[PDB]
């Protein structure tokens, strides 16, 4: 049944670094042969491609590091995902998944299987075990994995109820070593929930998936790319303001990269993560000094980065894009932001991928600053080269701020600033907003770390060994804010609440003209107004639209994890405990912007909740609609009756 | 008995990272109290000092990294060594050793115990288990330790004769990552035998031990410092010539350090070794960027290095040393090289330690290029900051070449070049030298790696788990060289054979004037000549005087390890398999210099073989006597009848 399919899906993720020792899994893997049948998949091309990869010494063996930002790794993972996705029936998909689990590389199998599960018509609504639990090596410092393995080695017969079911109290990166100050925001950048958010966003909309083939173009994906990255940057800026940090550092490709990253994580094969030192020179000569290369295109990541940056600048200035036809494509269309997002991201929907390329891929390779692989099968990728650990690197935020500057330039040059009438909602007036005291504190979070040790077959079958990891994760006391609206008739409005800063780290007031980009979508719902006075009450545990529209969320929770506050993986999901940025004992001061507008339903492609169905969104206004473009008159945003600015102090206790 | 004492000493070194689970060890540690007795040690000051360190929160707890190049680590290790050494009877020493094993930090205990054992009157002749087996984390890449721990976790009841007694085939540093080319000589720099040699040399003559208190001044220690480091540098240069490398890179403190080091080792607490990146800036600002410091003197290692280098330059130029009396001390005495060695090294015999200081300590701290410790108990030292891993870093060789340049300057300015009469041995003529074909090849070396995993008490007591590591170590086919001498009367001569290069990496002939420093002491023995023709036959397995005089060696082998080719630890010990530098299939060409001189017995302080007894040496000539100073006429060294130059090709096969 659906419950049994869910349980089997979860079973498939146990002890990924080891072969599946379940009897059914072993039998299925040893007896099944995808190429032998070759008829149960909707397409024979996908199976033929995967067979070509698998047989003729062009496949990533078990035990090798997998990176989705390496070309051949990506090609093989795509082939496996297509094999999983084009299974005519779920039974064939399960047999293929079991075989791949037992035979295909661990990281490659995990990525292909996850993308298939979120994207398959049948298994879209399947919950997935938290990634930080499945593959913990990417989420905890090696001082935690090594301690878990200490307990595992010591747990043998003697000393019962000792070295078992033990809680490892992990610290964040800067506890032991005095790492670079930017890594002081380690409890946020290295939070398992935030990295899970980024990883699940990339699972939902992979940078290599084509919107024509996989229906991701009905979700725009360019506006998604832009809005998701801008919201991540804005939430990071809010956290930095909380901790007294300033705006994210600006960096030049031609100046030594002033920031260094010292990861504390380790690969399951005993290989430590690459380290980027302070003031690292990013030039071909310096970042390939003392290396072989010769036929590695990533060795020249600097020249490719400069080329793609130049091309993006040119297309944004002109507003005219080059296509394979070499013709003139208008970028001023209604969906010009979408075209720009596809162009910059590098997804198969890019106007000309050969010309604009994957700027982010080469930027991550260069800023990761690790040795170029001697061979395909001997690769040493950095944090920036994985989705699960990208947010841990400050260079991640600096790189994507450099990217979003391009979108800001496009909007500034080609978008007309909103006037009073465009934002006006005649007959609606937000009288005042009451928000309960916003308090943020730290609490311990317990996660099943047992997947980081090597279990014996009996232990595997019975899960006898248990080892937890406890981590201080920011949490907030539940709050409920009220919105009072005085309408003129029974209209159907859309309410959009934003969270942004009012004062910078130096206490200076930030004008909306230089502050529109720092606003974080706090809630985005639809309310049916009535003539006269209305009161809108919203709880903290009812907000599912943080920095992202998730309208069909919680119906998947009520089914999969609804058989509380359990890692969803449904849509993207920002941690409910990280919604409010850390405050101060005195209370760092932010402001909430409340907006109300008439309903504009989105062009939903289909009713079924699914990636690419278009059912995600609330309204058809541009994402972050009031602040999606530069603001030329702050007093205009203050004077709108259907708007309201309200100031709150978030209090940190601990 | 002596055998039982040896077995107990070896037992003390099992599973150092874990508490000793032997019943006797636990009983002794829990019942014994060194401060409680306080009378069994020759001095109450040492016990009082160690008690002060141990009780009042100024002691290094178990599980913390220990570095002998940190001031407070060194002070505590010295206190513990003095506690071990001043045990009036061996029984008290054993009780103290057991207690420290069970209670004192692992690295600190290991260092203090080893130094005491080599330096104690009673236990000088005790063999010690190989350091690369006792504390393998400093000798193998973490890809080996993690694999051993994989096997340990998997070895539980099921799968017998599987994951036990397994051989791990380890590779050298550049196998996986394309590390900097200087790390291509990894099979030599990272050889367990060579690093054991350096570590045992530093155990025998620690940089902090006073020659007055511990009789190390009867071994000069300054000439030892110089000659040992010069011979290490020369052997490294021979290896570099074998592999086509050139002279060791010269570096300026004021220019970015062009070489980078990427260690693959990991600390037992799951912390990866520090990495030095290519072209690392060594200035205060750059190597402390983004760090706290504030009361760390090592934070200003650059200024201290410059100061001490300036002082050393000044004293070598003047030949006049500053003392606490501030008076003029002649450096031109017979033992002026000894004074210079004590001055540069920084041992308590230094003429004024406050003024000249420990140049090597700060140089290692700076070139290690790691984060300065946030606290005494949270330290992250580099390879250069341990004796067991110093030779793995190319910066080690560059640093000590920079040091030995000072001694070269002293000798060039203040020593008169030898004439024909000084080197003459009238009546002696080396007719010709025959050396068997010198062949070097690789073979697997098996070492007990079981000490890198965590065993249960029953496994500890029975040593049930066994895991070996196999490594390709250079070995040479046994050879026997003949020396023909035509004497005039029955004299007693000293034979000194040197190994040095004839052609550089570019095929150019090296003149003795620029080649005297590159000669490696191959053998140094005494033969009783007879009137007329003599023939001297020496086997390869009878040479114990490689780059170091060990006359009282092999009598300790015949007793301790003599109850073959087992890691000695007696005196220093260069690996017998690394005596001949790797050749080439065509055969890299070197030359042997054979010298004969009349006997000059050394001023032996005592007959008993022991560190500081002066019994090490063969003759009283200056170490490397023919080549201890610059050569102003190579033809002079060729024309001496009692000398002979012979060319050999060493053939590499494999």
Residue numbers in the entry:
A (entry chain A), B (entry chain A): 25 to 587, 595 to 685
From the paper:
Here, we show that coating the cryo-EM grid surface with ssDNA, or other negatively charged polyelectrolytes, reduced sample aggregation and improved the distribution of macromolecules in holey carbon grids for cryo-EM. The samples used for testing, hexamerin, human 80S ribosome and apoferritin, exhibited undesirable properties such as protein aggregation and/or affinity for the carbon support on standard cryo-EM grids. The use of polyelectrolyte-coated grids was essential for the determination of macromolecular structures from these samples. Hexamerin, human 80S ribosome and apoferritin are soluble macromolecular complexes with a predominantly negative surface charge.
Hexamerin is a 57 kDa protein from the haemolymph of insect larvae and pupae. It forms homohexamers with D3 symmetry. Purified T. castaneum hexamerin at a concentration of 5 mg ml−1 in pH 7.5 buffer containing 30 mM HEPES and 100 mM KCl was used in the experiments. When vitrified on standard holey carbon grids, T. castaneum hexamerin aggregated, rendering most of the particle images useless for single-particle reconstruction. The auto-picking procedure, as implemented in crYOLO, efficiently identified the hexamerin particles. The final structure reached a resolution of 3.1 Å and the surface regions of the cryo-EM map of the hexamer were of sufficient quality to enable model building. The mean shortest distances between automatically boxed particles of hexamerin, which has a diameter of 13 nm, in electron micrographs recorded on standard and ssDNA-coated grids were 16 ± 2 and 40 ± 13 nm, respectively.
